[PDB]
Design a binder for this molecule. Structure first.
Ligand code: 3QB
Ligand code: K
Ligand code: K
Ligand code: K
Ligand code: K
Ligand code: K
Ligand code: K
Ligand code: K
Ligand code: K
Ligand code: K
Ligand code: K
Ligand code: K
Ligand code: K
Ligand code: K
Ligand code: K
Ligand code: K
Ligand code: K
Ligand code: K
Ligand code: K
Ligand code: K
Ligand code: K
Ligand code: K
Ligand code: K
Ligand code: K
Ligand code: K
Ligand code: K
Ligand code: K
Ligand code: K
Ligand code: K
Ligand code: K
Ligand code: K
Ligand code: K
Ligand code: K
Ligand code: K
Ligand code: K
Ligand code: MG
Ligand code: MG
Ligand code: MG
Ligand code: MG
Ligand code: MG
Ligand code: MG
Ligand code: MG
Ligand code: MG
Ligand code: MG
Ligand code: MG
Ligand code: MG
Ligand code: MG
Ligand code: MG
Ligand code: MG
Ligand code: MG
Ligand code: MG
Ligand code: MG
Ligand code: MG
Ligand code: MG
Ligand code: MG
Ligand code: MG
Ligand code: MG
Ligand code: MG
Ligand code: MG
Ligand code: MG
Ligand code: MG
Ligand code: MG
Ligand code: MG
Ligand code: MG
Ligand code: MG
Ligand code: MG
Ligand code: MG
Ligand code: MG
Ligand code: MG
Ligand code: MG
Ligand code: MG
Ligand code: MG
Ligand code: MG
Ligand code: MG
Ligand code: MG
Ligand code: MG
Ligand code: MG
Ligand code: MG
Ligand code: MG
Ligand code: MG
Ligand code: MG
Ligand code: MG
Ligand code: MG
Ligand code: MG
Ligand code: MG
Ligand code: MG
Ligand code: MG
Ligand code: MG
Ligand code: MG
Ligand code: MG
Ligand code: MG
Ligand code: MG
Ligand code: MG
Ligand code: MG
Ligand code: MG
Ligand code: MG
Ligand code: MG
Ligand code: MG
Ligand code: MG
Ligand code: MG
Ligand code: MG
Ligand code: MG
Ligand code: MG
Ligand code: MG
Ligand code: MG
Ligand code: MG
Ligand code: MG
Ligand code: MG
Ligand code: MG
Ligand code: MG
Ligand code: MG
Ligand code: MG
Ligand code: MG
Ligand code: MG
Ligand code: MG
Ligand code: MG
Ligand code: MG
Ligand code: MG
Ligand code: MG
Ligand code: MG
Ligand code: MG
Ligand code: MG
Ligand code: MG
Lengths: 50, 96, 75
RNA sequence: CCAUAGGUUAAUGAGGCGAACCGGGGGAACUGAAACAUCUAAGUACCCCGAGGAAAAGAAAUCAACCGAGAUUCCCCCAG
RNA sequence: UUUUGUAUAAUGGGUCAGCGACUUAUAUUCUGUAGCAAGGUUAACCGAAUAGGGGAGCCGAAGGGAAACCGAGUCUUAACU
RNA sequence: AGGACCGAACCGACUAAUGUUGAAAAAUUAGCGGAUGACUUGUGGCUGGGGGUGAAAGGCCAAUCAAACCGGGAGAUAGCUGGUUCUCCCCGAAAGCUAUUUAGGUAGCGCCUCGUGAAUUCAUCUCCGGGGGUAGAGCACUGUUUCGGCAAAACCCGAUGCAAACUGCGAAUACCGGAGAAUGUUAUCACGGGAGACACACGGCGGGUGCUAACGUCCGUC
RNA sequence: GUUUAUUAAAAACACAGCACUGUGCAAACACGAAAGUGGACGUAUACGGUGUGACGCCUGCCCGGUGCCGGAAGGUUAAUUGAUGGGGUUAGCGCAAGCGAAGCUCUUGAUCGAAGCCCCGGUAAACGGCGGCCUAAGGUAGCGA
RNA sequence: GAACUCGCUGUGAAGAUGCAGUGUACCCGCGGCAAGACGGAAAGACCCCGUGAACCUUUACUAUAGCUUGACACUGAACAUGUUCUAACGUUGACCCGUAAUCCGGGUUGCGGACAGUGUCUGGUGGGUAGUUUGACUGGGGCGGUCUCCUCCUAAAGAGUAACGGAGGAGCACGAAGGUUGGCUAAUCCGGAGGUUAGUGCAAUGGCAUAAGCCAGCUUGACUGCGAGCGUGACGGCGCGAGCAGGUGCGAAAGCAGGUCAUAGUGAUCCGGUGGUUCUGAAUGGAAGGGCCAUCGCUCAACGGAUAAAAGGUACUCCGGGGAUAACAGGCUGAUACCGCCCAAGAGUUCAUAUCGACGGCGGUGUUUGGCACCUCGAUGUCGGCUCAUCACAUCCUGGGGCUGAAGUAGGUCCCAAGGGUAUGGCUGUUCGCCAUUUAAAGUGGUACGCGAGCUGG
RNA sequence: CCGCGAUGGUAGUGUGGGGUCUCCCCAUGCGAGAGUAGG
């Protein structure tokens, strides 16, 4: 029932993490500061489709 | 490779890589080969004439392997940093 | 309705008292802290105790609760 | 209707046989895949037609790689 | 012979004579042995030639990397304690 | 008149006995059915193999039929069964684990052998350092149990037992490590050439299962 | 009457009779890559297929399932056609980044599109079914250890 | 196979001419009989196994002849967005000729007519036909159950350890239920007692107060690259991990943080999709395609995953095998069965013991139902009857005897006793049983449930 | 640092041997737990 999602870098590098989410309970977009290894900085990552 | 029906090693492991066509037409030359050419100029054609490299070789690199004990002109070959030092120390020269 | 079991996990003491170990070496695999980490011993996420220095394994019973601690005496 | 079909005669040739090789028309399955259907066996076995002392192929609308080679056939490599 | 195990009431053989089952080719690896040795060896073919010629090739003397590429290093990684 | 009746020839084949290395690879003997019919018989002809023909039994198609016979593909394939031929010397298994359309097959590992290399490498004993939760024991815990007392018969207390999935205790042994001697044809480990084996059996000890039944069955260990 | 030549002769097969169904003749159907041939030198009072099995009295209810027959509005749907969008290439335009006509080209797949199926009916001497609230309908006549 | 080829009781791959012990036995024919040589015959037909076969079935799978649909072709002309036309094409209508010809062709004519029909393509239908699949474990097979992962016990105090052994769980959840800093401590009973007897996101075990339990604030370390060393695996793999570099959160800082108390929450490879990319780019520049990095698609659950794609029947059967494995009989066993005994509740007017023996206890036999799978699958014929038997005694009759609730007659019960004896019929394949009628009685068992190289064949 | 305990006996048990072998016994080595005196 938890669905796979991409977290996509806001730095425009195309780097992404993957995780899961319960979209029924939590329909709002997951946003987290995560390390982008391309630019080598912590930047905001935002949910997108897998 | 048959293992009794268990997925065999050469199928449970993934394929990898590709084969380079450029690698097949690239050779390595040892320092010990530099004296074997006729006339003290080392290029693709003189290496081919001396049977050091095959006729379809288009690219060649001189590496630090064996010794060079004579002045040699190397023309139109890549040379390693160590091979360059060895050739120049023996009174040779390298031409791009 | 029975007929099931899980794979045995090879828990227990890997290096006994007085054994010389290199740093990183696993001393005990366990479920929870049946043994506790003393001097120069770390505790992994699965409660594995491992050596953080080269030396000899030492078991000891200390504290008010009278708990089994494992330490490394550095060589 | 002209004619053409058709008819008769003459001349010339063919026909049938033969072990392999050769070109062409058709063309399996067992088997292997540890089952089996894609795949394999194999364009093999076999059937059929045709030829010759050989046959077939053959004188680039071919390769190559900016250098060049120069019809076809066969052998050794390239290379499992 | 087959079996955990056969005097076995498990199998096979009436007897004799003759015949009757790990081969051959090619590739590949290891061992022994011989030659030559940072080299070794030629294939087809030519040659009346077991000679001699023929070194086209093949293996070896360098590796690392998927590869470009670098090279006694190289790959990994922005970079290695 | 009649797929009418009784009954020979003729055509069949219901019963019994015989025969069963027969007189005979289907008969003989005594009886039995049809006997002008959907009858029977001579000669010749036609139908051909996934095909024929069949008042249908998978019947028959040359003593052959749920796919004829002959030749070919062909030495199909056979994880199955059988068999495998002279001599001596040295070493010497396994019947286990893991996986498997796997279970009587096979693969890696274990165990055998040959070669090469290498440490006081290995074993026994003694001493030293260790972790145990088994045997036994016990009843605080988790359950179970009996008696008395006490009392909302609970609870609590005293007394008594029981436990593979109970432990406020806890051996012997075994195992890991260290040190030391003696002994042992390196007995050890690694790498490489060649395997076989992966149906085990009984006996002792510790157990599950079964009835502390089985020359039973399933593990551990000798 | 027929049958398992060679262990079964029968209650099995066939049968006259009955019914359903196909078939308008270059018939259906069958043998045949085909030409043709059988059906038949027959023509629906005929021919094929299927089931039942003289005769007598009879042959009930169920069309939901599967088949067959009829329907044909609607949904769905093939080849075909190639609208539209996206990309590759490059004449150019750009100082460079890039952009980018025509052509060629890779891809996308609008529109068109029959039968079938879904769908709407019929049909049991079609295959079949024929109750303890439920079903398509609950076994009639006759018969019954 | 060779034989100098006896009985018995044991033994023993478990039913012995050949072994042990013992008994008996002069050497050799002939006629007879079939109890044994697990006699001869046929590599068991039953049964199981083999990733064997054949043929048969079907709403198994995949195909396919046939049938059927449309598009384009052969295929044309006038408007309609209707029909008509003739010239392609059809004619198994007529007539004429080749011609001595119910073939064929040509001609003339009628009819039909761009229809029909055929080719290519295409949807449907298609056991009519074809190739195949249709798992394994299993105290025989089948049916049922099971197949991967986690926890406990079995498990013999290191690890590991089997069974169709005993018990339960998983195929997730959570941007907080993660990180850090600070703060807090339960169940239950009546503010106090009590001390984790609660709690853990979910099984069980081992943990947890320094709490891992619980609350709040601030957060994204549920970081990226690596990794000394170690654990665990045949391997593929899986696990634990200080520390190093970069960048981060919390905290005052020390420090802590590479998800969660830990141990389940899973799927190799191939093929392909998406994004990225100092790689590759078949003349060259590009591109396509490939590589590399990130990621996606399996109840492939038969969970090391034969295929993208699969069910059955065979008594019409067939081959290779197995006593590795079932049906008969033997063997081991003796739960069950049958027989005997111990105790004595009681019944029996009274009285436990004439007779019966509750609750319980102990044996014997091999004797029923079974268990096991040791012998036999290169065959050990299997029920009943008939014929012919032979032994045991737990005795049915006849013989001897004790007790009696034995007056007699006739019984009951127990002991001794195996010499001899121990029904015919109706019904049914029956053994048995019921029935009729006998008898002194119509015994119970063993003998391959005696006896098919003796008969029968229900 | 982390709030009991002898002695003796008993249970168990390694090795070897034995029996009437579901369980024991003997030789030798190891030797609890509980409880008792006591602290
Ligand atoms: C419950 C049955 C048990 C099996 C019976 C026996 C067997 O197979 N017998 C054969 C016999 O066939 C013939 S008798 C007609 C032969 O003559 C005879 O020797 C013999 O082979 C047949 C009856 O099946 N087996 C060994 C065990
Ligand atoms: K360790
Ligand atoms: K095939
Ligand atoms: K195979
Ligand atoms: K056997
Ligand atoms: K036999
Ligand atoms: K060799
Ligand atoms: K050599
Ligand atoms: K390095
Ligand atoms: K045939
Ligand atoms: K193996
Ligand atoms: K070896
Ligand atoms: K044992
Ligand atoms: K008859
Ligand atoms: K209907
Ligand atoms: K363009
Ligand atoms: K004797
Ligand atoms: K006899
Ligand atoms: K005409
Ligand atoms: K037409
Ligand atoms: K079993
Ligand atoms: K059994
Ligand atoms: K860090
Ligand atoms: K499997
Ligand atoms: K089948
Ligand atoms: K028997
Ligand atoms: K008795
Ligand atoms: K009395
Ligand atoms: K048998
Ligand atoms: K008798
Ligand atoms: K008496
Ligand atoms: K008697
Ligand atoms: K009989
Ligand atoms: K016999
Ligand atoms: K006889
Ligand atoms: Mg050369
Ligand atoms: Mg286990
Ligand atoms: Mg476990
Ligand atoms: Mg195969
Ligand atoms: Mg000639
Ligand atoms: Mg020619
Ligand atoms: Mg030129
Ligand atoms: Mg056996
Ligand atoms: Mg013996
Ligand atoms: Mg004998
Ligand atoms: Mg024998
Ligand atoms: Mg045999
Ligand atoms: Mg024999
Ligand atoms: Mg290299
Ligand atoms: Mg008559
Ligand atoms: Mg007849
Ligand atoms: Mg007669
Ligand atoms: Mg008559
Ligand atoms: Mg008559
Ligand atoms: Mg039949
Ligand atoms: Mg015949
Ligand atoms: Mg066939
Ligand atoms: Mg062949
Ligand atoms: Mg053969
Ligand atoms: Mg020896
Ligand atoms: Mg496994
Ligand atoms: Mg105990
Ligand atoms: Mg216990
Ligand atoms: Mg030691
Ligand atoms: Mg095996
Ligand atoms: Mg085994
Ligand atoms: Mg076994
Ligand atoms: Mg065993
Ligand atoms: Mg035992
Ligand atoms: Mg046994
Ligand atoms: Mg036993
Ligand atoms: Mg008759
Ligand atoms: Mg017959
Ligand atoms: Mg007969
Ligand atoms: Mg006709
Ligand atoms: Mg009928
Ligand atoms: Mg339509
Ligand atoms: Mg009706
Ligand atoms: Mg009625
Ligand atoms: Mg005997
Ligand atoms: Mg005689
Ligand atoms: Mg006789
Ligand atoms: Mg016999
Ligand atoms: Mg056999
Ligand atoms: Mg048409
Ligand atoms: Mg079909
Ligand atoms: Mg079929
Ligand atoms: Mg096949
Ligand atoms: Mg098959
Ligand atoms: Mg099976
Ligand atoms: Mg253990
Ligand atoms: Mg142990
Ligand atoms: Mg083991
Ligand atoms: Mg085992
Ligand atoms: Mg198990
Ligand atoms: Mg390392
Ligand atoms: Mg593919
Ligand atoms: Mg290019
Ligand atoms: Mg090109
Ligand atoms: Mg790409
Ligand atoms: Mg598996
Ligand atoms: Mg598999
Ligand atoms: Mg057979
Ligand atoms: Mg057996
Ligand atoms: Mg038996
Ligand atoms: Mg009495
Ligand atoms: Mg009683
Ligand atoms: Mg028995
Ligand atoms: Mg057994
Ligand atoms: Mg036997
Ligand atoms: Mg025997
Ligand atoms: Mg025999
Ligand atoms: Mg007596
Ligand atoms: Mg007598
Ligand atoms: Mg007597
Ligand atoms: Mg007397
Ligand atoms: Mg009677
Ligand atoms: Mg008998
Ligand atoms: Mg008897
Ligand atoms: Mg007999
Ligand atoms: Mg009979
Ligand atoms: Mg003491
Ligand atoms: Mg004590």
């Amino acid at each position: 029932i938890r669905e796979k999602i991409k977290l996509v870098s806001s730095a425009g590098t195309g780097h992404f993490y993957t995780t899961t989410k319960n979209k029924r309970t939590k329909p709002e977009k997951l946003e987290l500061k995560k390390f982008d290894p391309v630019v080598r900085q912590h930047v905001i990552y935002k949910e997108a489709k897998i | 490779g048959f293992e009794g029906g268990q997925m065999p090693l050469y199928r449970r492991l993934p394929k990898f890589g590709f084969t380079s066509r450029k690698a097949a037409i690239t050779a390595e030359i040892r320092l010990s080969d530099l004296a074997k050419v006729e006339g003290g100029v080392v290029d693709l054609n003189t290496l081919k004439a001396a049977n050091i490299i095959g006729i379809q070789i288009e690219f060649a690199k001189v590496i630090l392997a064996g010794e060079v004990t004579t002045p040699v002109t190397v023309r139109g070959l890549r040379v390693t940093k160590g091979a360059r030092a060895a050739i120049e120390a023996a009174g040779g020269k390298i031409e791009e | 309705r029975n007929g099931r079991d899980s794979e045995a996990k090879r828990l227990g003491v890997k290096r006994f008292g007085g054994e010389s170990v290199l740093a990183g070496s696993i001393i005990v695999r366990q479920r929870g802290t049946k043994f506790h980490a003393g001097a120069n011993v770390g505790c992994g996420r699965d409660h594995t105790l491992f050596a953080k220095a080269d030396g000899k394994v030492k078991f000891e019973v200390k504290g008010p609760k009278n708990r089994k601690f494992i330490s490394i005496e550095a060589e």
